[PDB]
């Protein structure tokens, strides 16, 4: 709850997406470990895209946030909506076992 401090969260999330969406697409790396590989004039070293993958996992997970929310909505409301058929101490409580018995009482027939 508390939607005053909910805008102050999403204003920092949208701050981050608009900062990731101003980086150039041709971003490359240089580790201090490539001198053991002896890269030629055109050798295509395999450590060039170790910053470019991490900048797109970050940018795309900040857009699928309401996607895992819908799955976690469908996960929590499917494991907890029963709450008394799998949890043992709740199905072995007196009030739940009597109530699950009480809803299965068939109607009495008159004469």
């Amino acid at each position: 709850g508390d939607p005053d401090t909910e805008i102050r969260i999403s204003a920092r999330i949208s701050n981050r997406i608009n900062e990731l969406e101003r980086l150039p697409a041709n971003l490359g790396t240089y580790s201090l470990d490539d001198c053991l590989e002896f890269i030629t004039k055109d050798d295509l070293s395999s450590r060039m895209d170790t910053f470019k993958i991490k900048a797109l996992v970050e940018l795309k997970s900040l857009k699928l946030l309401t996607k895992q929310k819908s799955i976690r909505q469908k996960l929590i409301n499917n494991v907890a909506s029963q709450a008394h058929h799998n949890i043992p101490y709740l199905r072995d409580s007196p009030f739940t076992a009597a109530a699950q018995r009480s809803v299965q009482i068939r109607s009495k027939v008159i004469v």
């Binding site: 969260i9 920092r12 997970s61 900040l62 895992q68």
Partner: protein, 84 residues
């Protein structure tokens, strides 16, 4: 299992008594010398609730009477209305 907005949660947003009671009842159910000390403690408490019991019951006999006295004067009206 991915903490995505978990940092933004942490950015903006930065008993003992009954345990020792349950420990103590566990000690009373080891030595039966305390069970007599606990049963006799409960029995004067049982006698304490007996004095609690009839002090309510002696109020209920009184309060039944005034509500019954509301129906005596209702019944005494029928002595004259039926005889009319």
């Amino acid at each position: 299992s991915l903490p995505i907005e978990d940092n933004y949660i942490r950015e903006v947003v930065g008993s003992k008594l009954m345990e020792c009671v349950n420990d103590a009842v566990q000690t009373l159910l080891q030595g039966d010398d305390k069970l007599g000390k606990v049963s006799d403690k409960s029995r004067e408490i049982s006698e304490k609730y007996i004095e609690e019991s009839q002090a309510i019951i002696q109020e209920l006999v009184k309060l039944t009477m005034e509500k019954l006295e509301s129906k005596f004067t209702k019944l005494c009206d029928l002595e004259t209305q039926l005889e009319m």
